[PDB]
Amino acid sequence: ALLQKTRIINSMLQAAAGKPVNFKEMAETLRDVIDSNIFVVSRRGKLLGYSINQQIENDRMKKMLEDRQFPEEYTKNLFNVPETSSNLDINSEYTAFPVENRDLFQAGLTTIVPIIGGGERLGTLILSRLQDQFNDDDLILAEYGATVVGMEILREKAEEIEEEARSKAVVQMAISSLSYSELEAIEHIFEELDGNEGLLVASKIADRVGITRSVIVNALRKLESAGVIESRSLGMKGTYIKVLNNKFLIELENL
Amino acid sequence: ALLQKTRIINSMLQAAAGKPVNFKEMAETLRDVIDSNIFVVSRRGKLLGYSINQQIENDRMKKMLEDRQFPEEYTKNLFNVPETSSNLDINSEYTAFPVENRDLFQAGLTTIVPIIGGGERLGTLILSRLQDQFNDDDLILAEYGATVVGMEILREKAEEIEEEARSKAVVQMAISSLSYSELEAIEHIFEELDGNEGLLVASKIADRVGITRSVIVNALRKLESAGVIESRSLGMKGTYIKVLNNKFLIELENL
């Protein structure tokens, strides 16, 4: 039924497709397929997701869960595990962890799989059982699992930078197309405006600043047509604006 | 030794990391691990890579290889296989292929794994053997294999459109910065130039066309400053230019 088991993980990957990464979800699916407690811990050792199907009396663990994080101590110790290590209990004679960190295997069997992707140690996958051995098939699953979670940390962060940069880009591209006086205007406007939103009299700034209303508006138009702001007038004696690009205001500061 | 077999795939993936996707290589690695002929065919049914370890008398396939492509016929039929289909020979009674495409199984055992990733059917992985059956362990590997190829087809195509676009984008942005006269100049320059490279006398076009050297120059500057072209003079009685943006010439046409 192993083929089938891997097939699940396959479909769970295929499923997460266009949808924001959910670690808790993945944690569960693994928990189910491999039949073990599942813990997903970042490079920096932060707890990213987890799922439990058997209670295991472990202080260090419970504390870590409460903390949603590992102490630097362990975090490092963990990162230093270079490859899958399996079936570690408190009796395990081995290298990976120094004596005073063995409280991690206080009870039950633990397996450590590094999460590697995009040529980086991305984090670590922790599995624990009360007493059932991790045989090879388990390991296969666990490893495939970690591999998949890898690809998600990647998708996750990749999506992240694409947004950040794209938005910034667009702002710049828009700003670029401003005349001196247009930009001059925009600057004065948001110098005047009280953050993300608010309204002002276009025709008033025009006098106050020494720039035709016609261009002030024009400038607004450009920003709007690039989708950075949203503007609606109120039969003048008012015109109102909200920014729709979170990077915009910051970028504007940089000049 | 299955675990080990998967682990190869694993490190093959991890290996491809920062390096340009190569399908022939992956083909080989899978050929090796699965112990079967491997062919990687796109959504559009193009041949992407392949590797052979055993000769099989199959005209349809030899033909396909020569063509580096399938006929729309098969391409379609292939795409319609919704999930892994295994050990299909000429005698197989089943649904997947209409009997006029049976010539596909002319000889030996064929197995088809759809390549799915990022929520799309990305292509198809085809494996063939002269007579050894595909057991589950093979299918696990073959499927893990397809999966890996997946994220690569993705990466490859993604990188592809990121370059295409970015180039185009920057051309436009640079064009955007030009005066009527400046642009007019550019246009006559490349109308005069014979493709990607060559030289002319700036001062000559100036009279020929009715635009000051001074601006013709400055137009070139602008382009260069944006990294579109590369310009070096030769103490006049010559100035020389090379386009560094493959999209630029094309875009220019579109005006």
Numbering used by the authors:
A (entry chain H), B (entry chain A): 2 to 256
Which statements did the authors publish about this structure?
In low G + C Gram-positive bacteria, CodY is a global regulatory protein that controls the transcription of numerous genes. CodY from B. subtilis and most other low G + C Gram-positive bacteria is a DNA-binding protein that is activated by the branched-chain amino acids (BCAAs),2 leucine, isoleucine and valine, which may be viewed as signals of the metabolic status of the cell, and GTP, which may signal the energetic status of the cell. CodY from B. subtilis consists of 259 amino acid residues.
We have solved the structure of unliganded CodY in three different crystal forms containing 14 (form A), 10 (form B), and 2 (form C) molecules in the asymmetric unit from data sets extending to 4.6, 3.0, and 3.7 Å spacing, respectively. The following descriptions relate to the structure of the form B crystals, because these crystals diffracted to the highest resolution (3.0 Å). The 12 residues (156–167) that link the previously reported GAF and wHTH domain structures are in an α-helical conformation. They extend helix α5 in the GAF domain and connect it to what was previously named helix α6 in the wHTH domain, thereby creating a single α-helix spanning residues 137–177. Within the CodY chain, there are no non-covalent interactions between the domains that exist as discrete entities. Examination of the molecular packing in the crystals of unliganded CodY reveals that the basic building block of all three crystals is a tetramer. The GAF domains exist as two pairs of dimers flanking four wHTH domains. To facilitate comparison, we superimposed the wHTH domains of one of the chains (chain A) of unliganded CodY and Ile-bound CodY(L3S) onto one of the corresponding domains of QsrR, FadR, and IscR in their DNA complexes and observed the juxtaposition of the recognition helix in the partner wHTH domains and the DNA. This simple modeling suggests that the unliganded CodY dimer, in which the recognition helices from each chain are related by a 25 Å translation and a 40° rotation, could bind to a DNA duplex of ∼20 bp.
